[PDB]
Amino acid sequence: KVFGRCELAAAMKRHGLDNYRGYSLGNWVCAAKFESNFNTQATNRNTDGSTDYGILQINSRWWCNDGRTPGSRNLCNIPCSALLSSDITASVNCAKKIVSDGNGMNAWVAWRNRCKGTDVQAWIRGCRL
Ligand SMILES: [Cl-]
Ligand SMILES: [Cl-]
Ligand SMILES: [Cl-]
Ligand SMILES: [Cl-]
Ligand SMILES: [Cl-]
Ligand SMILES: [Cl-]
Ligand SMILES: [Cl-]
Ligand SMILES: [Cl-]
Ligand code: NA
């Protein structure tokens, strides 16, 4: 599924991301825009042989099982395919464990490079929330 801009902001708020561990709604929308263009079916392969999955691009080295990442862990206790659903629940729950690991939203490199410090509120302007 490809979400409308105002449509995803509404679903993320419903699942309790608005200010989780101190991060506002526009930070999560911006992160999704640049990680996936609002597409839940987004995937991308990393050089160490791990893979990234879904609207927020979560990785198989630590966080999910895909059966193809040697010596890895499954700290979220889930298969990576759950991160591709039109239902965003598994993606939101695992992003909560990751953002708590010690380093906050710096765990997402594109958030640090395209959305940290910017007028993130513009991503929610004109939306009925
Ligand atoms: Cl847009
Ligand atoms: Cl915001
Ligand atoms: Cl594995
Ligand atoms: Cl393969
Ligand atoms: Cl494990
Ligand atoms: Cl599994
Ligand atoms: Cl949803
Ligand atoms: Cl933090
Ligand atoms: Na794994």
Residues in the chain: 129
Resolution (A): 1.6
Could you give phi then psi for residue 36, rounded to 5 degrees? -135, -5
Tokens 């940290």, residue? 116
Query: How distant is the alpha carbon of residue 32 from its chain centre?
Result: 6
The method of structure determination was X-ray
Rounded Cα gap, residues 111 and 35, in angstroms: 8
Distance between CA atoms of residues 29 and 46, nearest Å:
23
Name beta bridge partners: 2: 39
Question: Which residues are designated catalytic?
Answer: 35, 52
Q: How many Å separate Cα 104 from the centre of its chain?
A: 13
Extended strands (E) in the chain: 43-45, 51-53, 58-59
* Gap from CA of 120 to ligand 3 centroid (Å): 36
Q: Which domains does the chain have, with CATH numbers?
A: 1-129 (1.10.530.10)
- A 10 A CB-CB count for 23 gives 18
- Tell me if 125 sits within 8 A of 91, measured CB to CB: no
Contacts of residue 6, Cβ cutoff 8 Å, sequence gap at least 6: 124, 126, 127, 128, 129
- How many of the other CB atoms lie within 10 Å of CB of 125? 10
